[PDB]
């Protein structure tokens, strides 16, 4: 009954964009034939799906999404736990150094050293990596959303992907041992903080100690 | 660092021996310096400012 | 003049002396890349990095190991470098990795 | 002065070599990575000397305050006119000091 | 391949002296990087060398 509930839910809100046979309207939507359940999971769970594009709240909730995914697959899969739930902690890896090297070579050019945002050309940008979970990161690098290259499982193995997932989950949630994180970027916030705090306090001390006329 | 230390030394020596400038005011003239003497007051203020900046 | 020249003469190097052996003689560094052929017909693979030190830090690539929207960074392989198990092979792979004109984008 | 003191401290722990090594240190997210000896020395200063992170942060903040104070002082001299006839050589000396400080900080954070 | 080789009693004369180090088979010859590092750590030890007469 998954294939049945999937089509009805798809025919209501998805055929308008892509098509009756999931082949792609020349103006509205893409083909969607070769994509698996992973693209359906990512795009729907991140709220990027049905649209007129930042992340938002999903409309379908964890059962309709699975039915639509099974339907689109029936015409890249998501990873599940041996109990049928979606994997959350199983996707983490143990080689943080390898994950970090791979991230700095493949991913840091667009997001950041530590998964902050990045600017792209003429509008578009790369988002922050904090509000994404492990399955969302996996499906993101498996399907390659807009302007993001698609990383095949044959060019970037599953174990390397798990190491990268572990590395980003550590780089997004570890406490800074040096004081207040000034935004995660380099010396631009540091120069701002310098001019606004240190020099202001020094000049105020000079005004207090010295005279004026 | 050595070159900067030498240039800072020469700079401060010139400032010490060519006396400081001042703003025009009541008792001020192109020929005098109105202010405070080093010994009790100026050294005290300089040391306090140094401590505050280190803080 | 003599002491100035003898004091500053140890730093000066000629950028155009031929030191890099290629398939057509010896060339100057700034004209060679690492993709330059060495013995007139040598196979230089487009190898990708694995980020690990198990045995290979560089593996070959087949045309079907990518999708129609992917980009991969590749380096020159030159099989006589081998995987990095021996110290010699490890040094060869490290000099492959640390070269400013080595990386290539394959789309 | 603060820069001098903190730099003298920092010189007792730094190794400015470019020869490559593997980390195998306490900062687990970098264990097994090929780095230079200078980067490993800086990581050691940060994570295994009691107080080293504090000292190098003081050093970098003192460098930024140095540059900003030099610029504000140049602004005062220029706008009040303290550079005129008797003190032109001192203006020139200060300008040289500014250039030297710029390049010294640039070499520092590299 | 080997920077250290084992010794048998008959590998010496009645007027010989030899410097010996601790071997520990698990170190192996210095072909791989890990074994090379183990052997370097053997050779750079200030209480390792032993005189056998
Ligand atoms: C490098 C590292 C250094 C880093 C910087 C740190 C300090 C920067 C210097 C600023 C502080 C200046 C202090 C100072 O000058 O006082 C000197 C002061 C001299 O006073 P003075 O006699 O009135 O001046 C000389 C002429 O009268 C002056 O009469 P004038 O009005 O005709 O002036 C003519 C002037 C005309 O020329 C100039 O104006 C330019 C001078 C540039 C010098 C090159 O010629 C000079 O005065 C040249 C003086 C140069 C000597 C001192 C400067 C050395 C600093 C240079 C640093 C490196 C370069 O000597 C002191 O007595 C001070 C106290 C020390 C005595 C204590 C003794 C206690 C017992 C000892 C026990 C032993 C243990
Ligand atoms: C300036 C550019 C052109 C953009 C301005 C923003 C724009 C959308 C609206 C401006 C409105 C304007 C045109 C009409 C008049 C409004 C009125 C006069 C005041 C508005 C001006 C604004 C608010 C001043 C800010 C201008 C801005 C470019 C200064 C940059 C400051 C730097 C970049 C901050 C660096 C910095 C960053 C970037 C951090 O992420 C950070 C994170 C955590 C801690 C610290 C920091 C930090 O210091
Ligand atoms: C006054 C002086 C510049 C005149 C020079 C005369 C001229 C003929 C010389 C020739 C030089 C050439 C021809 C052009 C110079 C232009 C430039 C290329 C010079 C290079 C270096 C130059 C000498 C530096 C001078 C800059 C200037 C003197 C700094 C003084 C700034 C003022 C007076 C400080 C007052 C206190 C301050 C406003 C408190 C509030 C904080 C504000 C927001 C500071 C603004 C601010 C600053 C100043 C940052 O540097 C900065 C850097 C990174 C991020 C953010 C900021 C930032 O917000
Ligand atoms: C260690 C690790 C954890 C961090 C290292 C950080 C490092 C930079 C620590 C530095 C400590 C440093 C010595 C702090 C400054 C101490 C200050 C100056 C205390 C004295 C200030 C005040 C309470 C007394 C008044 C000062 C005057 C009257 C006496 C001394 C004095 C001083 C200090 C002057 O600088 C001075 C400059 C020019 C003319 C005269 C004087 C002068 O008389
Ligand atoms: C004698 C002894 C040291 C020999 C060693 C014996 C030997 C056997 C032992 C071996 C041990 C060796 C290896 C080490 C020895 C020592 C070692 C442990 C030290 C390492 C470095 C260490 C950590 C430094 C600590 C010292 C520190 C705590 C004290 C710093 C205080 C000093 C340096 C302040 C100087 C201030 C400044 C540079 C002087 C300038 C003169 C003053 C400020 C006038 C400035 C000034 C002028 C000039 C104006 O014209 C003016 C005009 C208008 C308005 C204002 C001003 C104005 O302020
Ligand atoms: C500014 C550019 C002007 C350069 C003028 C010199 C022209 C001719 C030129 O520069 O060619 C070198 C010769 O050098 C010299 O005597 C130059 C001395 C002139 C000093 C200029 C004073 C101002 C030899 O080639 P090379 O083999 O690379 O240098 C090796 C040898 O110096 C030497 O073993 C040693 O210095 C090595 O470091 C090495 O690199
Ligand atoms: C006369 C001197 C006055 C001229 C001003 C000096 C300008 C610098 C002169 C300079 O260095 O230019 C090179 C020339 O080299 C040389 O040996 C010239 C001899 C060195 C002259 C300077 C030494 C000063 C000593 C003698 C004191 C160009 O050849 P190269 O550097 O090898 O680059 C490419 C290859 O030639 C390539 O084969 C060819 O196909 C071209 O693409 C290109 O020329
Ligand atoms: C006409 C509005 C529109 C609506 C409604 C819509 N889509 Fe899309 N969709 C697009 C467009 C345009 C793209 C192209 C990529 C982009 O814009 O991000 C896309 C991309 C996709 C992709 C990924 C394409 C790829 O190449 O990987 C999938 C999967 C998808 N849509 C499925 C869905 C699902 C599930 C729904 C839920 C009913 C839906 N679409 C509703 C317009 C729409
Ligand atoms: C600049 C090219 C680019 C590269 C290279 C790239 N990204 Fe992205 N990434 C993007 C863009 C643009 C988006 C936004 C997609 C969208 O809006 O639909 C995105 C989205 C994502 C998201 C989802 C963000 C969210 O809010 O859910 C994740 C997770 C992600 N990327 C991870 C990665 C990883 C891991 C890599 C390295 C394998 C990588 N990215 C490489 C540009 C890139
Ligand atoms: C005088 C002006 C100086 C400036 C502007 C300056 C600036 C800097 C800066 C910005 C750094 C990078 C700090 C970091 O790691 O984040 C640095 C590093 C360093 N500085 Fe300085 N410095 C100065 C003087 C000195 C002096 C006098 C010494 C030694 C006597 C010194 C010793 C060092 C050392 C050893 C490092 C590397 C250690 C490290 O990076 O952790 N510096 N410098």
Swiss-Prot record, chain A:
Q: List the disulfide bonds.
A: none
Summarize the subunit comment: The cytochrome bc1 complex is composed of a cytochrome b (QcrB), the Rieske iron-sulfur protein (QcrA) and a diheme cytochrome c (QcrC) subunit.
Q: Where is heme c 1 annotated to bind?
A: 14, 17-18
Q: List residues of the Cytochrome c domain.
A: 1-75, 94-172
Membrane-spanning ranges:
191-211
Q: Where does heme c 2 bind?
A: 107, 110-111
Supply one GO molecular-function term: ubiquinol-cytochrome-c reductase activity
Which GO cellular component terms are attached?
Answer: plasma membrane
Which organism does this record belong to?
Mycobacterium tuberculosis (strain ATCC 25618 / H37Rv)
**What does this chain do?**
Cytochrome b subunit of the cytochrome bc1 complex, an essential component of the respiratory electron transport chain required for ATP synthesis. The bc1 complex catalyzes the oxidation of ubiquinol and the reduction of cytochrome c in the respiratory chain. The bc1 complex operates through a Q-cycle mechanism that couples electron transfer to generation of the proton gradient that drives ATP synthesis.
**Known catalytic reactions:** a quinol + 2 Fe(III)-[cytochrome c](out) = a quinone + 2 Fe(II)-[cytochrome c](out) + 2 H(+)(out)
Range within the parent protein = 60 to 280 of 280
Report membrane topology.
Multi-pass membrane protein
- What is the official name of this protein in its record? Cytochrome bc1 complex cytochrome c subunit
Q: What is its EC number?
A: 7.1.1.8
Swiss-Prot record, chain C:
GO MF term list: 2 iron, 2 sulfur cluster binding; metal ion binding; monooxygenase activity; oxidoreductase activity; oxidoreductase activity, acting on paired donors, with incorporation or reduction of molecular oxygen
Cellular component GO terms, alphabetically? Answer: peptidoglycan-based cell wall; plasma membrane
Which range is the signal sequence, renumbered to this chain? none
Per the record, the domain of life is: Bacteria
Main localization category: membrane
User: Which compartments is it annotated to reside in?
Assistant: Cell membrane
Q: Which UniProt keywords apply?
A: 2Fe-2S, Cell membrane, Disulfide bond, Electron transport, Iron, Iron-sulfur, Membrane, Metal-binding, Oxidoreductase, Respiratory chain, Transmembrane, Transmembrane helix, Transport
Extra remark beyond the main annotation? Was identified as a high-confidence drug target.
Free-text function comment from the UniProt entry: Iron-sulfur subunit of the cytochrome bc1 complex, an essential component of the respiratory electron transport chain required for ATP synthesis. The bc1 complex catalyzes the oxidation of menaquinol and the reduction of cytochrome c in the respiratory chain. The bc1 complex operates through a Q-cycle mechanism that couples electron transfer to generation of the proton gradient that drives ATP synthesis.
Q: Which family does it belong to?
A: Belongs to the Rieske iron-sulfur protein family.
Spell out the subunit comment.
The cytochrome bc1 complex is composed of a cytochrome b (QcrB), the Rieske iron-sulfur protein (QcrA) and a diheme cytochrome c (QcrC) subunit.
UniProt protein name: Cytochrome bc1 complex Rieske iron-sulfur subunit
Full protein stretch here: 216 to 322 of 429
Curated annotation (Swiss-Prot), chain D:
Name the residues that bind heme 2. Answer: 73
Give its localization: Cell membrane
Membrane-crossing residues? Answer: 63-83, 91-110
Protein residues bound to heme 1? 59
Family, per entry = Belongs to the cytochrome b family.
Recite the other comments: Was identified as a high-confidence drug target.
- Tell me, how does this one assemble? The cytochrome bc1 complex is composed of a cytochrome b (QcrB), the Rieske iron-sulfur protein (QcrA) and a diheme cytochrome c (QcrC) subunit.
The function of this protein is: Cytochrome b subunit of the cytochrome bc1 complex, an essential component of the respiratory electron transport chain required for ATP synthesis. The bc1 complex catalyzes the oxidation of ubiquinol and the reduction of cytochrome c in the respiratory chain. The bc1 complex operates through a Q-cycle mechanism that couples electron transfer to generation of the proton gradient that drives ATP synthesis. The cytochrome b subunit contains two ubiquinol reactive sites: the oxidation (QP) site and the reduction (QN) site.
The identity of this protein, by name, is Cytochrome bc1 complex cytochrome b subunit
Q: From which source organism is this entry?
A: Mycobacterium tuberculosis (strain ATCC 25618 / H37Rv)
Full-protein interval shown: 56 to 165 of 549
């Amino acid at each position: 009954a998954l294939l049945r509930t999937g089509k009805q839910l798809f025919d209501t809100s998805c055929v308008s964009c892509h098509g009756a046979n999931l082949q792609g309207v020349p103006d509205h939507g893409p083909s969607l034939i070769g994509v698996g359940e992973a693209a359906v999971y990512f795009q729907v769970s991140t709220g990027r799906m049905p649209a007129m594009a930042p992340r938002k709240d999903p409309i379908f909730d964890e059962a309709q999404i699975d039915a639509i995914g099974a339907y689109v697959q029936a015409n890249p899969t998501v990873v599940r736990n041996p109990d049928g739930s979606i994997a959350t902690q199983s996707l983490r890896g143990n080689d943080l150094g390898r994950g970090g090297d791979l991230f700095r070579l493949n991913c840091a050019s667009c997001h950041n050293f530590t998964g902050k945002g990045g600017a792209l050309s003429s509008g578009k940008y790369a988002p922050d990596l904090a509000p994404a979970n492990e399955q969302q990161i996996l499906t993101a690098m498996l399907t390659g959303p807009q302007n993001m290259p698609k990383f095949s499982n044959r060019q970037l193995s599953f174990e390397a992907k798990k190491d990268i997932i572990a590395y980003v989950k550590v780089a997004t949630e570890a406490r800074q041992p040096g004081g207040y994180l000034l935004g995660g970027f380099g010396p631009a916030p540091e120069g701002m903080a310098m001019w606004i705090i240190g020099m202001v306090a020094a000049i105020g001390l000079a005004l207090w100690i010295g005279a004026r006329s | 660092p050595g070159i900067i230390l030498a240039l800072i030394g020469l700079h401060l020596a010139l400032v010490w021996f060519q006396k400081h400038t001042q703003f025009p005011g009541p008792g001020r003239t192109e020929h005098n310096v109105v202010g405070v003497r080093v010994m009790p007051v100026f050294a005290f203020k300089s040391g306090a400012f140094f401590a505050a900046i280190v803080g | 003049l003599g002491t100035l020249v003898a004091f500053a003469g140890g730093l000066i190097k000629n950028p155009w002396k031929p030191v890099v052996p290629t398939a057509e003689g010896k060339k100057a560094v700034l004209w060679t890349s690492g993709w330059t052929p060495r013995y007139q017909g040598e196979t230089i693979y487009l190898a990708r990095a694995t980020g690990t030190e198990d045995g290979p830090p560089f593996i070959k690539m087949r045309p079907e190991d990518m999708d129609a929207g992917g980009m991969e960074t590749v380096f020159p392989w030159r099989e006589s470098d081998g995987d990095g198990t021996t110290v010699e092979s490890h040094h060869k792979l490290q000099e492959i990795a640390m070269g400013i004109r080595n990386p290539v984008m394959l789309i | 002065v603060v820069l001098l003191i903190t730099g003298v401290y920092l010189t007792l722990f730094f190794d400015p070599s470019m020869v490559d090594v593997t980390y195998n240190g306490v900062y687990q997210p970098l264990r097994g990575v090929e780095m230079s000896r200078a980067y490993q020395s800086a990581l050691d200063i940060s994570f295994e000397v009691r107080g080293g992170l504090f000292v190098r942060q003081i050093h970098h903040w003192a460098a930024l305050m140095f540059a900003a104070a030099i610029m504000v002082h140049l602004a005062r001299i220029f706008f009040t006119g303290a550079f005129r006839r008797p003190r032109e050589t001192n203006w020139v000396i200060g300008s040289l000091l500014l250039i030297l400080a710029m390049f010294e900080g640039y070499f520092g954070y590299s």
